[PDB]
Design a binder for this molecule. Structure first.
Ligand SMILES: *[C@@H]1O[C@H](CO)[C@@H](O[C@@H]2O[C@H](CO)[C@@H](O[C@H]3O[C@H](CO)[C@@H](O)[C@H](O)[C@H]3NC(C)=O)[C@H](O)[C@H]2NC(C)=O)[C@H](O)[C@H]1NC(C)=O
Length: 361
């Protein structure tokens, strides 16, 4: 089984224990670690953070301890204008220059592959995404003639039904990618004046309008569209989403006035790292959706939807039963990487729980 784990560049700037450097990553925890977000300048892949070149080095040294560990660099991301990706891929001239620049860059900094994080191509881009993947892979195949291990090519893909149909020719890109990570954790969040869970595993017989907004449906849909199970990786979040209650109602369908208050360390409205949630739980009321099989907690006027060891192991058992390639974890830096916030002095409690299930099966 594969255990793909993302590490984010900006997590280094979090104050106190919140600060996370590649240095803190256990070399034997994940099978693949992806450094989150390279930029594109002059139509060539390039660094993002001022000290990325150093961090790349720190991350890749982990391979000295675990020679089997693979690392990839992800291009794109949320702060990267999709319109920018669109303009690059749409023009053969720009596209070819970008593709040409990747292998040398990856080789120079010690990466074993590239992860495409074009966050949301429109319907006009679907065709160009396919071309980008095909041509990028053809270049990786050609570069391997030089005697080195062929570069890996992966892509992060949203799990939303509409998003998939609109910009992804799954049947086509699946044959060129080494693995596809399904972002099965963005099924809810703010845009609606109601409370809800962003990463439910199952539909939950309750509501009906959105029988497509759960992990099980997304996985089944990808399998139907042509993505081979041995190339599909299910995304499991290590963070939680927070909301500010508009009333004293906390049950399903409770009104919302907006995202929750920022966390002490992550300082981003609407999200909390798992280590922040562990602190939040003290004095909070915990609940769990039996149908969706995911928990949520409330305190004062704050409502949090998250994943714990149990929900995470459950999702791991699920992808195993569906014979998928493995699991993907968004943000090792959002898990209790120090292991000093969530009681048990266990570092990476969420990621380790996933590894445990995958290790059994
Ligand atoms: C990722 O790469 C992009 C593209 O190289 C980079 O953004 C670009 O940065 C340029 C220089 O900072 C911007 O040009 C600036 O300078 C020119 C001439 O001096 C001005 O005419 C522009 O108005 C000015 N730009 C701005 C926004 O003020 C260029 O416009 C900008 N383009 C884009 C699409 O962003 C970006 O900084 C880099 N990301 C990081 C984190 O370094």
């Amino acid at each position: 089984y594969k255990l793909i784990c993302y590490y984010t560049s900006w997590s280094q700037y979090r104050e106190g224990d919140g600060s996370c450097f590649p240095d803190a990553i256990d070399p034997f925890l994940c099978t693949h670690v992806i450094y989150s977000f390279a930029n594109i300048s002059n139509n060539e892949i390039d660094t993002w953070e001022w000290n990325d070149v150093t961090l790349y080095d720190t991350l890749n040294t982990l391979k000295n301890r675990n020679p089997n560990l693979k690392t990839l660099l992800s291009v794109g991301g949320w702060n990267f204008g999709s319109e920018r990706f669109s303009k690059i891929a749409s023009k053969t001239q720009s596209r070819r220059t970008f593709i040409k620049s990747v292998p040398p860059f990856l080789r120079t900094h010690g990466f074993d592959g590239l992860d495409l994080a074009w966050l949301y191509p429109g319907w006009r881009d679907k065709r160009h995404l396919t071309t980008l993947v095909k041509e990028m892979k053809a270049e990786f195949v050609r570069e391997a003639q030089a005697g080195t291990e062929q570069l890996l090519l992966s892509a992060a893909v949203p799990a939303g039904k509409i998003a998939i149909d609109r910009g992804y020719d799954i049947a086509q890109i699946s044959r060129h990618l080494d693995f596809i990570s399904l972002l099965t954790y963005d099924f809810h969040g703010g845009w609606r004046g109601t409370v809800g869970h962003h990463s439910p595993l199952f539909r939950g017989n309750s509501d009906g309008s959105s029988r497509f907004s759960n992990a099980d449906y997304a996985v089944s849909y990808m399998l139907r569209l042509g993505a081979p199970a041995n190339k599909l990786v299910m995304g499991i979040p290590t963070f939680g989403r927070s909301y500010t209650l508009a009333s004293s109602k906390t049950d399903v369908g409770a009104p919302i006035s907006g995202p929750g208050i920022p966390g002490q360390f992550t300082k981003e409205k609407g999200t909390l790292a798992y280590y922040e949630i562990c602190d939040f739980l003290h004095g909070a009321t915990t609940h769990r959706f039996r149908d969706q099989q995911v928990p949520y907690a409330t305190k004062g006027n704050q409502w949090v939807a998250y994943d714990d060891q149990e929900s995470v192991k459950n999702k791991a058992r699920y992808l195993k039963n569906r014979q998928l390639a493995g699991a993907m974890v968004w943000a090792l830096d959002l898990d209790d990487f120090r292991g000093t916030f969530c009681g048990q002095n266990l570092t990476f409690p969420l990621t380790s729980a996933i590894k445990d299930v995958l290790a059994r099966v």
